């Protein structure tokens, strides 16, 4: 197979990068590179069997892997071009988050090497039904098709708003939306019936939202606000995908981070405003009205 050869090439590229990264808190390239390579070897061995490939055609296992491996190559070239034989720290942090996402997606859809994209179930039932009714057995769609299918229920305005949506949904920055990425998005921005209003209120129009930040980056950022107890920001958790991590400055100026209950974020923020904890988004004066 061409696919066999592509998988071989990917494993070799991640071994090069692993060796070039020999010089720690999650997400860490040092951890993720060999973990991804080990998972790809498992996929390679599993693809050698008859069936188990699931329902065929666009958006199936073979399509997913063609797109995933091409993206993995592009991301791996970015990391290589950056590594020596702070801008660099930020570029590598963003790429670590992307690699954490690519590993989590491959583990979700090919655990132990074995494809389950046609059986995968989303966490929120309304979103699960939308995916299976709209996309069928497929586990992956190009962005443009996904925007169109999503728009049967939740249309987004073309241009900057749609592009911001794409940036939020596309965890792996591949240009394609997997059923795993849609699971994460619909958990973060529940509840379903107002999905894109929730996303506009939280991820476009809220000063407390940060995208693609690590735990250590939020610990550093909020130190600017340590003399303003009540200051807070929120960002997606890197290690518990689909959940929020709220960073806030406590009464004594300590920067803490907490993962909410499985509740709409708007509710968690409204209750924490009432209780006097989440008051000054990103340390700014104006807390937006989430009613």
């Amino acid at each position: 197979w061409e696919e066999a050869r592509a998988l071989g090439r990917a494993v070799r590229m991640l071994q090069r990068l692993e060796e070039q990264c020999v010089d720690v808190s999650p997400p860490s390239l040092r951890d993720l590179l060999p973990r991804t390579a080990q998972l790809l070897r498992e996929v390679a061995h599993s693809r050698r069997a008859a069936g188990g490939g699931g329902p065929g055609g666009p958006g199936g296992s073979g399509d997913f892997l063609l797109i995933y491996l091409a993206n993995l190559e592009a991301k791996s070239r970015q990391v290589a071009a950056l590594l020596p034989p702070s801008r660099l720290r930020r570029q590598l942090a963003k790429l670590a988050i992307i690699f954490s996402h690519m590993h989590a997606e491959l583990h979700a859809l090919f655990p132990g090497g074995k494809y389950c994209g046609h059986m995968y179930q989303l966490t929120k039932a309304p979103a699960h039904t939308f995916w299976r009714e709209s996309c069928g057995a497929r586990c992956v769609l190009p962005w443009a098709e996904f925007e169109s299918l999503l728009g049967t229920c939740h249309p987004v305005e073309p241009g900057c708003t749609a592009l911001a949506l794409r940036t939020t949904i596309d965890l792996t920055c591949s240009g394609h939306v997997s059923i795993f990425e849609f699971d994460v998005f619909t958990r973060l921005f529940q509840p379903w019936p107002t999905l894109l209003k929730n996303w506009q209120l939280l991820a476009v129009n809220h000063p407390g939202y940060m995208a693609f930040l690590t735990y250590d980056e939020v610990q550093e950022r909020l130190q600017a606000c340590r003399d303003k107890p009540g200051s807070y920001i929120f960002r997606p958790s890197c290690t518990r995908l689909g959940q929020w991590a709220i960073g806030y400055v406590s009464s004594d100026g300590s920067i803490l981070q907490t993962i909410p209950a499985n509740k709409p974020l708007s509710q968690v923020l409204l209750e924490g405003q009432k209780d006097g904890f989440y008051l000054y988004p990103d340390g700014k004066t104006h807390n937006p009205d989430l009613t």
Partner: peptide, 8 residues
């Protein structure tokens, strides 16, 4: 641990 309890 990194992630602490709900300040309420």
């Amino acid at each position: 641990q990194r992630y602490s309890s709900d300040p309420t």
